[PDB]
Design brief:
The PDB classes it as viral protein. The structure is cut from a larger assembly and holds eight copies of chain A (243 residues). The first copy, chain A, has 243 residues and is of the alpha+beta class. Helix content of chain A is 21%, strand content 37%. Chain A has three helices and twelve strands, in the order E-E-H-E-E-E-H-E-E-E-E-E-H-E-E. In chain A, a hairpin with a 2-residue loop joins strand 1 and strand 2. The interface between A and C is large, with 42 and 42 residues.
Chain lengths: 243, 243, 243, 243, 243, 243, 243, 243
C-alpha cells in the first residue's frame, strides 16, 4: 500500500504561469515510457490469449463449507500406500447427509451445492523430515469387494504444495442432500437414501503414501468441502407480525 | 511484418573467392548464440510441459454463430444483482429452437453443434465511471419456483476483461435442435418439444451486478453462441440436371 | 495507440468452473510486480516533489494570437550582433495597437491579455551550414539615445532549439490595448496613446548573432504573441429579435 | 575529448571495389541503432517539453561583477541565527553606490544592470565538522525599528550545496546607480540619494544559522553581485586625432 | 523518421531570466552521457580499424544494367548438379555483344564498363519446401571438351540468402564491347569477334544443385550484369542548330 | 544439439476442448517477442549489408590437397628474420610438378586447380615461451641475385593465430601442372618446363621471425596447398567390358 | 595502461599456513567466470571464422612513402564533379619517375614496391559547413580523348571518414621505377620511358564532388603513396677500408 | 576446456594484402574492451588487497595422511551432545604413536610433520532427515577429572558443509613422533612416552550434537590427519652395490 494513491505533488500559479511538482512530472514521463511498452507487447499478449487457465475453485466463486469428518494416523512403508477409509456406500451416505444437515440447519436461504469435494489433508508427525505426500483413489466397486489395506505405489497423484488434495465427487454418482437451486423441505435420511438409485456402489476409497525412503507417521484430517451459491433476497428480517 | 523474409543480403564470387554480406554473416553469428540459448533452456521447458493450458473455445476450433436474443437495461444497487431473464423451460426452448432454425435455414451441410453457450454482454451507459461487472447463475428449479428479482452479492463470478461472460449449457440438461452429426430432416417445434424429457425444469437464470459503490445503469445484450463443425464435401454445386 | 484498451481477453464458465485468458492473467501478475515497484520508489518521488517546474506558456493555458509584424534579412559577422528594430516608443505603440486591433476586431467576448511576448524567429538562408543563434536585448533608454547598429558579443542569450526566442513584455512598462478583464469600448490610437504615461521611453531593442566563425545570412520574422483568456458565456447566438 | 572527431577510419579502392574500415562500419551500424532509439523516445520528450527549467543567472547570460563589501565572524547557537548586517537605508545606499562606482569607473561602454544580488558566502572555521547552513532575511521596516540580533530558527532557507545564497534585490525597492541602458553622466552620491524616493526604508537584514547541534564558528563574506549587459560597438579605439 | 529533427523544445525570457524546455535539457544531459561513452570506446574502434570490409558491388558505386539472357527449368537429384549453359566461346560472345548493344543503343555518353558479372538467379517451383541452393562453375576448356551434363557435389559454392550468385568475369579472359573509357564508334559483331584473341576458349560453364534430400524442380533466370560509370558533361541538350 | 527439435509438448482433446502443453505455449509467446525484435533491427542489418566479408578459402569451396615439401629448424635473433628457402626457379618448378603429380596420380576425374598457396607452418621448440611469429616474402628477382640469409625486421606480416601463413601464388607468374578445367594427358617435367615462359625468374623467397626479445628455436613445415574443383560425373564405375 | 601488470597482491606464511591477498583471490574467481564464458561462446566464434576481413594496407605491412605532387583548389556545383588532373600518359610518368627517384635516392637497400596508390586528400575551406566528399575516376583512354572538365554525379564513390581516397594503380597498366625485388642500377627517365609499352594510354583521371546543396570551395592535396618492403641485411656499415 | 586454446582463426595473403579471420578480429576487439575494464577496476582491487584470506590447509601445501582410528555410533537428544572419546593422555599417545608409525614405516625420506589435526567426520544413519551437526571440545584437564558423557548445548561450533570438523593439535601440548625436519632413528613407544613432559594432561575430549528437534542416530569416523613436507633428493634408487 502506497501513501498518496498516485496523487503525488500539486500545482500553483505565479504571474499567470503554472508550476507543477517535479516528481509528478517525472512520473508522467515514466508513465508515457511504460505506456509505449504496453503497446509494444500487446501483440504478444494476443498470442497468449489464444489459451486460458482455470480459477481455483476454493479461492473462487461460491463459499466454502468444510464439514470435517474424522482424523486418523497411519504409518506407511516406502513405496506403499495405506487405505484411509473403507465405508460402504450406505455408511458414506449417512455421514454425508447427517453431518451436513446437522451442521447447516437451519438453512434459511435458497441455495445450490455447486460441487462436492473430498478433502485429504496431511501433516507430518515428526520434525526434521523432508518428504512429500502421494495419493491414489477409486470411487466404485462391487459391494462385496473389500479393498486392499495396503498397495505398492505406481504412478500416483503427487499431493500439492500445501499437503492438501481435494477430489471432486460429481453429482453423477454421488448424491447431494440439495440437488439443485431449491428451498429446503421436510427431509430425513430414510427418504434421502430411498431416492438414491445405487446407494451401495459409489464410495470414495483413498490411499496415501510418501516419497520417503523410510517409514513415516502421518496425521490425516478428512473432510467434505461443499461449494455453495446462496440466493438471499435484498429484504429485511422482521419480528412477526411484519409491518 | 519484415521486408526481406530473413533473406537479407546476397553473395558473389571474385577470383574464385566467395563474398557474403556482412549483415547476413552477423545474423548467422547471432542465430548461433540464440540456438545455444534454446538448448540451455530446453530442460526448463520440459518442467513446464508437465502441465497444459486450454484453448479459447471462441478463438479456437469450430465456427461461431451468435443468435442474439434480446436487449435489456437494469439499474443495480451496490452489493446486489438483478435477474436478467425469468423464462420458463418451455419459453426458453421456444426461443432456442425458433431463433436458431429460422436464422440458419437452409442448413445445406452435415454438421454438429459442439457447444451451446449463454452469452451475457455488458456495457456502461454513463461515461467517466470506473467499475467492473459481476455475475451469478442457476440452471434448474421447481417449475413453480419463481426466482428473486434481486439478491445480495456473495462470492460472485467476476466478469472478464471484455465485459463478456459465456456460460456453457451442456447437452445433458439443455436440448439441442441438432443432436449429433446429422443432416437435417423435416422438423418443427412441437416434435422437438415432445422429445425433450424435462422441458420445464432446465432454464438459465442469470444475475448481474457491479463492483461499484453507487447505483449504475447497465445495458445488456443476451445471445446464444453455437459452436459448429461442418462436414462439407469437396464437391461442386451444379444447376440441375448435373452433367 | 493500442487496440484493446487493456480489455485483453475474456472469461467463460464450464461446469461451475471459471476460465480466464492466459494473456490477461499474465498481465495481472506483471501489474502486481509494477505496483510493488511504484510503492518502492514513492519515497524517492517525495524527495523530487520538494521542487517544481514551470509549464510552457505557449503550450499551456490561454490561447496564442501571433500578430506578425515584419520580416528582415541581416548578414552578421562572427562575434557580432546586428540590431533588429529601432522604432521609437510611439512607433512601437502604433504597430502594437494598430495591428492587434485591426486583426482581432470584432472582439465579441469578454477577455484579458495574460502576457505580451516579443517573438524573434530565425532561419538560415544557406543550406549545409551548422551554427546556432544568439540574442541580446534592451527595453528602455533616453528617447534621443540611438542604439548601436552592431555590437560585439558578450555573454548573450543562446536561442533555443527551434530557433525561437520569446521575450516577455510586462504590463509594467509596456501598455496593453486591453488592460484587464473587460468588454471593449469605443477606442482609438489617440486616446490609447494619451493614457500611456511614458510613451517614448519603452521600446524593444533586440540584437541577433550566431555561434559561427563565418558571416551568415539570416532571415528574421518578428511578431507579437498575445496570451489571452476568453470568458465566453454558455449561451446561444440568435438572430434578432431573440425569442 | 576524443582524438579523431568521429572521423575514424578511411577508404580505398582496389579493382573498382571499395573498401572501408571495419571500425567505421560498426559505428555506422551502432549509430543506426541509436537513431532508432531516439525516434522511439521522441514521444516521451514531448511530454517533458510541456514544462521548462530556469537557467542559472550566474552561469548564464550577462557578466558577473562581484563587489565584495566586508567580512565577519559569528558564533551561532543551535536552533538560532545571528544578524549579519544592520545598516540603515542610507548607509546601505552609500556602500552600494560608492563601492560599485569607484570599482567600475571608468565605465567606457553603454550598459544596463540586469539584476542586483546580495551574496552571502559561508565557510567553516573548524575542520572535521559536519553541518549545513541556514538563512533568513527581511528587506524593509520602520527606520526606527532595530532588528533582533539573534532569533530562533523557524522554517528557514537551507543554503545551497556550495554554501552560497544569492538574494535578488529588485529594481522596485532598491535603487541602482545605472537605471536602464545608458551612458554614464556626471554623477555623485548626493544627487543619487536625493532621487531615491524611500532611502531609509529598504535595507537587507539577513540572518545565518546552522543545522548543527553545537555552537559553530562561521566566517562570512558579503558581496553585491551585479549582472550586466554591455553594448560595446564593433569599432576601433584610436589615439586622437582619429584618422 | 522523427518529427522534430532534434529541434525539440524552445526558450523564452521572463524578467531577464532564461527558461528552456525540460525535455531538451534532459536530452543535453543524455547526449553528454553518450559523448562520454563514445570517448570510452574510441580506443576499441582503433583496434577494429586495423581491418576493412568490402562494399557490395551492386549496392555501391556504378549503375546496374541487367541484360537478361534466358530462363530454364531443371530437376536436380540429391547430391548432384546439372549444367545450366553449354554455349561455345563464339555463341557466348554473340549473346554478350548482341544483347548488350541492342538494349543500350543509342549510347549517348562517354562511359566505361567497370565489371561484368554472370548472374544466376534461382527460385523454387513447389511451395512448402525447405532447402538451399548450391553452385559450381568453370570458365575455360578445350573447345572440343564437352562438359558433363550432371556431376556429384563436392565442396560447392553455397548460394547466398536471396538465392542469387553473381560471378565476376574479369576483362582478362572475357572481352567487353566497351574496353575502357570511350565514346562509341561504328561497330559490329564481326570486327568485335576478330579482335578477340581466344574467342573459343573462354565461356562460363555453371552448375546448380541443392541441399535437399529429394529431387527438386528449379526455375533459373540467367543474366549478364554490367557495372557502368558514365561521364555525362554538365551541358544542355539543344535542338539543332544550337544558339 | 537439443533433444526435441523444437517439437516440445503435445495436444489432446477433452469434451471438444483443446489442451496444449504450457511449455510449448510459452515458447510461442517468446518466439513472438523475438520475431518483433527481428523486425525492429532489420533496418540496422540493411546498413550492415552495404558491405561484405570474404569466405575462408581453406574452409570454403574446393578441396584441400596439402603437398608437404620439407621441414626445417632455424634460430632467429630478435628483430631479425632468416630465409626459409633459396631454390632457383627451376628447382622450385621441379618440386612443384614432381611432388604434386606423383602424389595425385592416377588423376581419374576432370578438375581444375583453383588456387596455389605457399603454406608456412610454425611451432615453438621450447615450452613456457610467449611470443608470436612474423613473416616477409618476395616472389621474383634476377636469377643471379642471391638473397640475404638474414635481415632486420621492418613492417612485417604478423602470422595469424594458429601459426600458419598461406601465400597465394597467382597463375600469372607461377605455372600450374593443370592449367584449366581439363583431363590429364601424357605429360612429363621436361615438356612442362619448356612451356613455362620465365622458369628462372619466379620463386618464393620467404623469411620468418618473432616478436621475442631473445633468440628462439623454430620448427618449420613448408607445403604447397592446392584448391581443386572436381567434375566427377554421376555415373558408375564398372569392370570391363561394361554391360 | 594499468599499474601492476596483473601482479596484484602477494602472499606470506604464518604458522605453516598460507595467506594470499583478497583482491587477488577475487580476480582468480572472476577469471574463472570469464574463462567459462569464453568456452561458452567458442562455438559462436567458429561460425564467424568462416569469413575473413582485410588488413588496412596503410596501417599494415610495408612502409609508407608519400610522394606529394601538387595542391589545387576547386569550386564544385551541387551534383557535379570537377576534374583534378589532366596529364597525358607521358607527363604522368615523368612526375612519377622524377619525384620518387629524386626524393628516395640514394636507395641503399634491396627492396620492392608492393603497391602504388593515388592519394586524393580533401579539406573544406570554409568553417561551419556540413557535407561529405564524393569521387569518380578513370584510368585509360584514347591519347587524343580529352576528358570533360565537369560532369554530373551518378553513383559515385563516397569518400571515407577522414576525407582520403587512395586508389590502387596495379603493376599491370602503370609502370613502376622498381619492378621487383632488386638493387638499383644506373637509370634515367629516357630508358624508363622507352621500356614502358603503352606510355600514352594509362593515366589517372579523377573527379571530386560533394553531397552539399550549395557550391563549396575545396582544397586538394594529391600524392603517390608507395608501399615498400626493404630487405636490409643484419650487417654493419663501416668506413672503408673495412676491417 | 576449450578446443582451440585461443588460437582461433588463421591468416593468408592475396596480392600483398593480408586477410585474417573475422571471429579472431572480433575477439581482439572484445579483449580490448575487457582490458579497458580491468584498468577501470584495478583501483578497486587495491582496496581489497589491503586484506588477506587463508589457504585451505587440506587442499594446500603438504600432503595429507589420514590415520583413521575408530568408528562409533551415538544417539543424541535435542539440545545435547555426547562425548566421542574418553581416553587418558597415555592411551591417546599410544594410539597416536602406534598407528602412525606402523602405517608409515618404512619412512624412507627426510620429512617434517607440519600440523596434527583431529578429524571428526559425521554422516546420518536415517534418510529423509534435515539437520546439521554441532561440536564442542576440550584439550586438557586433571587426570582424575572424568568428563560428563552428555551435556546441554551452549554456543557450540557449527560443523561445516561437508560434515567434517578438523581441530588443530599444536606441537605445544601434543607430542609428535617426528618433531622437526629429521631422518628417523631407532625408536619405540617407551622412549617416546618417557620424553613427553605431561603425558597424562593433554587429550582431546570432543562432543557432538545436532540442530534437530528430535533424537538422531549418528555414525562417527575419527582420524588423525597429518600434514607432512617431504624432502626427497633428486637422486636414483639403485640395487646395491651402486655403480
Amino acid at each position: 500500500s502506497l501513501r498518496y494513491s498516485r496523487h503525488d505533488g500539486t500545482s500553483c500559479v505565479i504571474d499567470n504561469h503554472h508550476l507543477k511538482s517535479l516528481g509528478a512530472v517525472l512520473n508522467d514521463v515514466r508513465r508515457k515510457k511504460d505506456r509505449i511498452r504496453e503497446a509494444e507487447y500487446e501483440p504478444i499478449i494476443d498470442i497468449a490469449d489464444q489459451y486460458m487457465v482455470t480459477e481455483d475453485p476454493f479461492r473462487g466463486p461460491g463459499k466454502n463449507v468444510r464439514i470435517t469428518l474424522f482424523k486418523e494416523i497411519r504409518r506407511v512403508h516406502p513405496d506403499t500406500m495405506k487405505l484411509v477409509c473403507n465405508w460402504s456406500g450406505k455408511e458414506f451416505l449417512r455421514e454425508t447427509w447427517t453431518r451436513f444437515i446437522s451442521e447447516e440447519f437451519p438453512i434459511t436461504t435458497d441455495q445450490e451445492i455447486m460441487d462436492l469435494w473430498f478433502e485429504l489433508q496431511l501433516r507430518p508427525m515428526h520434525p526434521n523430515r523432508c518428504y512429500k505426500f502421494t495419493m491414489q483413489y477409486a470411487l466404485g466397486a462391487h459391494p462385496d469387494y473389500v479393498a486392499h489395506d495396503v498397495i505398492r505405489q505406481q504412478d500416483p497423484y503427487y499431493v500439492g504444495p500445501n499437503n492438501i488434495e481435494r477430489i471432486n465427487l460429481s453429482k453423477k454418482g454421488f448424491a447431494f442432500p440439495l440437488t439443485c437451486l431449491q428451498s429446503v423441505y421436510n427431509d430425513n435420511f430414510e427418504r434421502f437414501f430411498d431416492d438414491v438409485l445405487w446407494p451401495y456402489f459409489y464410495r470414495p476409497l483413498v490411499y496415501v503414501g510418501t516419497t520417503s525412503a523410510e517409514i513415516e507417521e502421518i496425521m490425516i484430517e478428512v473432510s467434505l468441502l461443499f461449494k455453495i451459491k446462496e440466493f438471499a433476497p435484498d429484504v429485511p428480517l422482521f419480528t412477526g407480525p411484519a409491518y
